[PDB]
Amino acid sequence: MAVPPTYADLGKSARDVFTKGYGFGLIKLDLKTKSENGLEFTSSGSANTETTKVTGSLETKYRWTEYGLTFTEKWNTDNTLGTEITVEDQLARGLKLTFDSSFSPNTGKKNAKIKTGYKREHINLGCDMDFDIAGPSIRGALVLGYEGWLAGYQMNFETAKSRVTQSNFAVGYKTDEFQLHTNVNDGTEFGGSIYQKVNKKLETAVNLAWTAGNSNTRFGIAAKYQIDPDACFSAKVNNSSLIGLGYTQTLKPGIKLTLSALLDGKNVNAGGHKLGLGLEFQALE
């Protein structure tokens, strides 16, 4: 059983480029300190320095053994409450148990979800059940792996009703320089993502999806261009003429500067620019 993170290859390309990147002109912060002693500490969030609009999250995390125990506690300023604790089973190799807590906006009480992952040498099985008091929802995930092609489908069955609430789908193939994954988010958005590497130049990813309702094609391309070990520029544009770039610059061992800006080609000069300035601090050594 040599089972790679195939489920993770379904959205690694897509999630990064698909995200809008709507910066309100504010500051993003991230600080992560790792120790291989069960300790992981993360501080993250965004603050608008124009008056005082600070919303973020604080993560108290526990990391014991790389492929063993990971405890995640996080609380958002939005009052939402997130928990995810993962334990890898040593008897059943490829068996992953994680206990999740869903982050309640108004309730303030975290809610219990049970997340299970079984890896078979060709395909990945995942059972995730969110327990609501009036009607729990059980979502089943299956990632398929067959010579050259990688596939996935995650379905949400709502026992609160008689019905599926979310339908997620993934298909594609992996090649030396090209990775393609067709991804579906509900019946409402279905499209494909292409990951292409330009040797020693830059790396580009394409995401475009069709959204049910009208004949809309959503097209977007992102490329991360690295010239320096301490400097890498990542730019993406969406077919809505929206150009957003993020510049990652390392200022000495421990400080990452991330400049991000979405320029609405619709009329940035008179319509406004989207801005995100982010500092990422890390303690490893």
Q: Please count the residues of the chain.
A: 285
DSSP at 93: T
CB atoms within 10 A of CB 175: 11
Phi-psi region of 45 (alpha: psi -120 to 50; beta: other; left: phi over 0): left
Q: Please calculate the CA angle 143-146-149 and round it to the nearest 5 degrees.
A: 85
* Residue 256 · residue 248 · CB < 8 Å: yes
- The CATH number that applies at residue 253 is 2.40.160.10
Question: Which residues constitute the domain of residue 45?
Answer: 1-285
Which segments are annotated as binding site?
A: 12, 20, 242-244, 260-264
> Solving technique for this entry?
NMR
Tokens 């510049």 map to which residue?
Answer: 247
Residue 139 CB partners (closer than 8 Å, separation 6+): 128, 129, 130, 154, 155, 156, 157, 166
| Nearest-angstrom CA–CA distance, 260 and 248 | 9
Which segments are annotated as binding site for ATP?
A: 12, 20
Which segments are annotated as binding site for NAD(+)?
A: 242-244, 260-264
Backbone angles phi, psi at 204, to 5 degrees: -125, 145
| Nearest-angstrom CA–CA distance, 284 and 219 | 38
Q: How many domains does the chain have?
A: 1
* Residue 149 · residue 156 · CB < 8 Å: no
User: In the structure encoding, which two tokens stand for residue 98, read together?
Assistant: 């994680």
Q: What is the DSSP string of 197-262?
A: EETTTEEEEEEEEEETTTTEEEEEEEEEEEEETTEEEEEEEETTTEEEEEEEEE-STTEEEEEEEE
